[PDB]
Design a protein around this ligand. Structure first.
Ligand SMILES: OC[C@H]1O[C@H](O[C@H]2O[C@H](CO)[C@@H](O)[C@H](O)[C@H]2O)[C@H](O)[C@@H](O)[C@@H]1O
Ligand SMILES: OC[C@H]1O[C@H](O[C@H]2O[C@H](CO)[C@@H](O)[C@H](O)[C@H]2O)[C@H](O)[C@@H](O)[C@@H]1O
Ligand SMILES: OC[C@H]1O[C@@H](O)[C@H](O)[C@@H](O)[C@@H]1O
Ligand SMILES: [Mg+2]
Length: 580
């Protein structure tokens, strides 16, 4: 008996009317004295309904261009469904009913069946568009991933960016393609049996192109701040509905299978029903199988068990893994020792910090909560993602950091892709891509100069505002065809096939997973009614024979996959083997 707060009749923005009658325009403003809509260059005064709600119906159809006029000031629509001329321009009226979907036989994907592949549309292909990305779907299907995780698509200012400066949350970023190009990408993924997830940013708006305060300052609060401006006030129902209505658009109207909520610790809300719970209620009301994931660092199971989200991006595994391979200790890496015994513990517990003191300077507190309630799929693990590559001064990938060998990189892949936790790969990871993933942006004027200055001061560091920084992050597909890139790719294909086919690796219960170590050798054991598997990873500098690893059980005898393709059960430095 939860009832959605959304009715298409009363939807804010521009919505096509039935019977070819045109478009209904609606907005909420708490402060404007005169309110008009300017459509195809002609102004029309809107009707005041009370509660700051204004409405007008006109016989203009999909394709019409408009903005609102508040006290005589032309102002973009925050509810724009498309912004062909960017975030300071006129919106286009969009009709979600026109696209010819062919994915009636697709029914979503369960979290336990996800292997995520994180795509940044602008760099994933030379063209940097949805249409070019769609052409790589057969490659991704054959690779063996099952869910694409797309970085944010809400329109932001400039001609490239990661997506976290999105300002018009309902408008797909025009350089990537039109709305129908996005729909075509999702339809094609579904036809190949791939899920598609979207990164959405409900903790802040980007610095340029967010006109919500022009309509009502009370969308935001001065009680707390974001990176870019005033905090999003989830005590204000119109602010709540701005993001729940957005989540429903992406899932229902663009057929996304799930959302990854960026930076959930910073969605501050003291309401009786937290906004994260209401988001889950609103998306479930759609009557589908859509998922919600939280990017959350607090090691807080309540995100799943109270807010009814599906899982959590949990970085302790990533960090413990990177420290193991590099020894680095700057910033949050100081929270981890790394090593076989440390990795065995972190995996055992799902995350490391369950309430113990986090001693990282500038951040000291008792971090986290007991992970007992969470099951393996609820933890999303990775060894690379946009942040853990791009937030490094030179944006280098794990195999490109000093002191990491390709053998260690390949071992890490075997550990990630045989665990029952839900794994994510970053684009190009699978072939040990040669290109970095650097932070890039393209803001105008003083804001752009400020970004360049901020990056220099924070940490030669590539200028985020330079075209070269964007181009240097483009994937080079041809390189995957040769050398160590091809060798790494063969291993990723083999691991993803094993994950799919092996009846014991199908395990998704932490009850069936144990871990331990002997010196620098990590072991991870799965036992179910289908049999036993053990992953052994030699994190030492020497060679270790499997026969000589001290284990509290009898090691399985059959060699299922060796990361360097060896015939015998021996582990060179950094190498791993799966036995059964
Ligand atoms: O303060 C947040 C919540 O903390 C507790 O819940 C966590 O810790 C419990 C054991 O201490 C676990 O059983 C639970 O799964 C964790 O989320 C507290 O029990 C909750 O009521 C609080 O909301
Ligand atoms: O060599 C001095 C450092 O030794 C330890 O760090 C190494 O060993 C860890 C496993 O115990 C690895 O995870 C790490 O990558 C290695 O650098 C020690 O933890 C450090 O404090 C010492 O500086
Ligand atoms: O992964 C742990 C880290 O999560 C980060 O994203 C937080 O911003 C940081 O303060 C913390 O150290
Ligand atoms: Mg020993």
């Amino acid at each position: 008996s939860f009832q959605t707060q959304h009715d298409p009749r009363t939807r804010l923005g521009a919505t096509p009317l039935p019977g070819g009658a045109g478009t209904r325009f609606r907005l909420w403003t708490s402060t404007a004295r005169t309110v008009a809509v300017r459509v195809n260059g002609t102004e029309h005064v809107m009707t005041s309904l009370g509660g700051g709600i204004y409405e007008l119906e006109l016989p203009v159809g999909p394709g019409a261009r408009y903005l609102f006029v508040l006290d005589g000031v032309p102002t973009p629509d925050p509810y724009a469904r498309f912004l062909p001329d960017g975030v300071h321009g006129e919106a286009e009226v969009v009709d979600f009913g026109t696209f010819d979907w062919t994915d009636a036989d697709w029914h979503g994907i369960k979290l336990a069946d996800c292997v995520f592949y994180e795509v940044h549309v602008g760099t994933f292909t030379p063209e940097g568009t949805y249409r070019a990305a769609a052409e790589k779907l057969p490659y991704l299907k054959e690779l063996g991933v099952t869910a694409i995780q797309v970085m944010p698509l809400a329109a932001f200012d400039g001609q490239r960016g990661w997506g976290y400066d999105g300002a018009a949350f309902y408008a797909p970023y025009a350089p990537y393609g039109r709305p129908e190009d996005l729909m075509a990408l999702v339809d094609a993924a579904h036809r190949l049996g791939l899920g598609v997830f979207l990164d959405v940013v409900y903790n802040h708006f980007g610095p340029s192109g967010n006109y919500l305060s022009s309509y009502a300052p009370s969308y935001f609060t001065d009680r707390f701040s974001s990176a870019w401006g005033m905090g999003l006030d989830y005590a204000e129902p119109h602010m709540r509905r701005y993001v729940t209505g957005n989540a429903r658009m992406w899932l229902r109207d663009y057929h996304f299978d799930g959302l990854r909520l960026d930076a959930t610790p910073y969605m501050t809300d003291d309401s009786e029903t937290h906004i994260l719970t209401e988001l889950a209620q609103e998306i479930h009301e759609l009557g589908g199988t859509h998922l919600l994931l939280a990017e959350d660092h607090r090691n807080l199971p309540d995100l799943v068990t109270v807010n009814h989200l599906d899982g959590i991006w949990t970085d302790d595994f990533h960090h413990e893994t990177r420290v193991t391979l590099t020894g680095e200790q700057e910033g949050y890496y100081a929270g981890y020792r790394g090593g076989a015994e440390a990795l065995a513990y972190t995996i055992r517990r799902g995350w490391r910090y369950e309430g113990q003191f986090w001693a990282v300077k500038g951040e000291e507190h008792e971090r986290g909560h007991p992970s007992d309630a969470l099951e393996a799929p609820n933890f999303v693990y990775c060894i690379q993602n946009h942040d853990q590559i791009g937030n490094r001064p030179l944006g280098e990938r794990l195999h490109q950091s000093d002191g990491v060998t390709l053998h260690e990189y390949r071992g890490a892949a075997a550990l990630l892709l045989t665990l029952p936790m839900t794994p994510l790969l970053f684009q190009g990871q699978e072939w040990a891509a040669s290109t970095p993933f650097q932070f890039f942006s393209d803001h105008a004027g003083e804001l752009g100069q400020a970004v360049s200055e901020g990056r220099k001061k924070e940490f030669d560091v590539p200028d985020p505002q330079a075209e070269q920084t964007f181009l240097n992050s483009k994937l080079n597909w041809a390189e995957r065809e040769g050398g160590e890139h091809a060798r790494t790719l063969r291993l990723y294909r083999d691991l993803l096939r094993l994950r799919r086919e092996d009846p014991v690796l199908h395990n998704r219960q932490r009850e069936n997973l144990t871990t331990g170590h002997d010196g620098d050798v990590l072991w991870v054991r799965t036992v179910t009614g289908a049999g036993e598997r053990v992953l052994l990873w030699n994190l030492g500098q020497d060679t270790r024979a499997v026969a000589e690893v001290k284990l509290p059980f009898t090691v399985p005898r059959r060699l299922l996959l060796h990361t360097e393709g060896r015939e015998d059960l021996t582990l060179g430095a950094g190498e791993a083997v799966l036995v059964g």
